[PDB]
Design a protein around this ligand. Structure first.
Ligand SMILES: CC(=O)N[C@@H]1[C@@H](O)[C@H](O)[C@@H](CO)O[C@H]1O
Ligand SMILES: [Ca+2]
Length: 457
């Protein structure tokens, strides 16, 4: 013989539905058995816009069972009735007001906790009142109702709110008085032509029956759905990016991030495009080949890596990925180290390297020791009575970090000194016969040395 109650609800797309919200159960014998209520059945799907049905069941001490049913709408776009024109409006006293109470004051109703709720939007009327709207093309009507707070001191105010859809009563309140907290009415208006909002007089005629339809609005189902994109994002996140090439994994990571962003758009085309792109990048993934051999042209770099890994013979991509620290001896060319994606530390002081660009994309290389390089860059051959040489020494950013050029005779005398550019030109017509050295001094964070050329006059 238990009594189980629950009224229709509505949520927006952003909100988390509580299937048990506003469900209560009582039993004269058992007392309050709300916590004993179970969901018997539902068509509810999370993440879906719709008007869902939930059936609730409860069973007391003596095994007697009661049921009830209500709908829960999950909607997107809203249209305030105060932003529309009514087809017709009657009112017992005063004028129907858009976005104000009938008194002209702000719409104000009573909350359950006896605070006052002040509303920006709604319809202010007065019993007896019938207001008719064109309801074509809308899904849900939602409103708060109660006695306007302007008449809080008037004692007698009393009304009943009723909602008719195409002439049929679909929702109503009990009699509401000044001290009655606001009530919500959530009504299915799908495939309808008119809604009629009625404020009846209850007791004491219409006296002081200032009545508000606060935040009265239509709510429509969403014109997008985020569910497939959500699933694709989840599917993508399951994949082990270690199975795939750096490049293709990066593309996928980027598609995942764009998917997460597109969910916030609440826009069908944006969501659909992000899903298409994510599916594309998933299908575009390329399996890594950790056994592919890496070209390491510098025999000293090859020996350095072989020693670090304790192996002989060819170095593979997987081998390169295992490097976290590496010490170099005798290296001139870092070609191959582009593949050392996990490298954290490179100890290469007193090597022979003029170009750090192969290290540029090593994202974890936080410790680079590359001081006191000496690069024997060979002979320059005079032509047109001059020598022209390259003085580019590249850091990881591809910046030329050469600082100064010094030209030195056979007796160690500096004969020319200038700030370094990308190239230098030396007149050889006015030099005494013999050997000359060109010292290109360079310096940058962690990277320094001399690049040396010889020329003969
Ligand atoms: C819009 C408005 O304030 N109308 C009031 C009405 O509520 C009240 O029943 C009546 C009592 O004489 O006085 C009118 O002025
Ligand atoms: Ca009344």
């Amino acid at each position: 013989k238990p009594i189980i109650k629950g009224e229709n609800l509505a949520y927006s797309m952003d909100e988390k539905v509580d299937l048990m919200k506003g469900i209560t159960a009582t039993d004269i014998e058992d007392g309050n058995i709300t916590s004993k209520v179970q969901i018997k059945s539902s068509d509810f799907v999370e993440g879906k816009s719709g008007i869902f049905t939930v059936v609730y069941s409860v069973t007391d001490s003596d095994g007697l069972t009661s049921e009830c049913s209500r709908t829960i709408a999950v909607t997107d776009k809203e249209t305030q009735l105060s932003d529309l024109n009514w087809k017709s409006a009657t009112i017992g006293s005063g004028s129907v007001r858009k976005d104000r109470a009938v008194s002209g004051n702000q719409i104000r109703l009573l909350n359950e906790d006896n605070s006052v709720e002040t509303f920006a939007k709604g319809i202010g009327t007065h019993s007896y009142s019938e207001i008719v709207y064109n309801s074509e093309g809308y899904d849900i009507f939602d409103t708060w109702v109660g006695i306007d707070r302007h008449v809080a001191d008037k004692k007698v105010s009393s009304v009943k709110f009723k909602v008719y859809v195409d002439g049929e009563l679909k929702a109503e309140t009990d009699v509401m008085r000044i001290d009655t907290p606001k009530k919500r009415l959530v009504v299915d208006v799908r495939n309808s032509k008119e809604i009629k909002l009625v404020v009846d007089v209850a007791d004491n005629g219409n006296n002081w029956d200032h009545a508000d339809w606060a935040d009265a609005k239509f709510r429509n189902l969403a014109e997008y759905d985020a569910s497939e994109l959500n699933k694709a994002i989840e599917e993508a996140k399951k994949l082990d990016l270690n199975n795939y090439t750096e490049e293709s994994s990066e593309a996928l990571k980027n598609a995942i991030s764009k998917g997460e962003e597109a969910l916030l758009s609440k826009d069908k085309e944006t969501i659909n495009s992000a899903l298409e792109e994510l599916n594309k990048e998933m299908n575009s993934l390329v399996k890594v080949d950790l056994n592919a051999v890496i070209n390491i042209p510098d025999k000293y770099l090859l020996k350095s890596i072989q020693n670090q890994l304790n192996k002989t013979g060819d170095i593979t991509l997987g081998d390169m990925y295992s490097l976290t620290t590496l010490t170099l001896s005798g290296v001139e060319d870092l070609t191959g180290l582009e593949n050392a994606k996990n490298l954290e530390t490179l100890n290469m002081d007193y090597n022979e390297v003029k170009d750090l660009r192969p290290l540029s994309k090593l994202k974890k290389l936080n410790t680079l020791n590359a001081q006191e390089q000496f690069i024997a860059a060979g002979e320059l051959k005079p032509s047109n009575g001059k020598v022209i040489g390259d003085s580019k020494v590249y850091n990881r950013e591809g910046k030329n970090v050469a600082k100064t050029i010094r030209v030195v005779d056979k007796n160690g005398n500096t004969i020319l000194e200038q700030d370094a550019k990308d190239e230098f030109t030396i007149n050889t017509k006015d030099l005494s016969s013999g050997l000359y050295g060109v010292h290109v001094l360079f310096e940058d964070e962690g990277f320094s040395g001399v690049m040396f050329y010889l020329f003969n006059v």
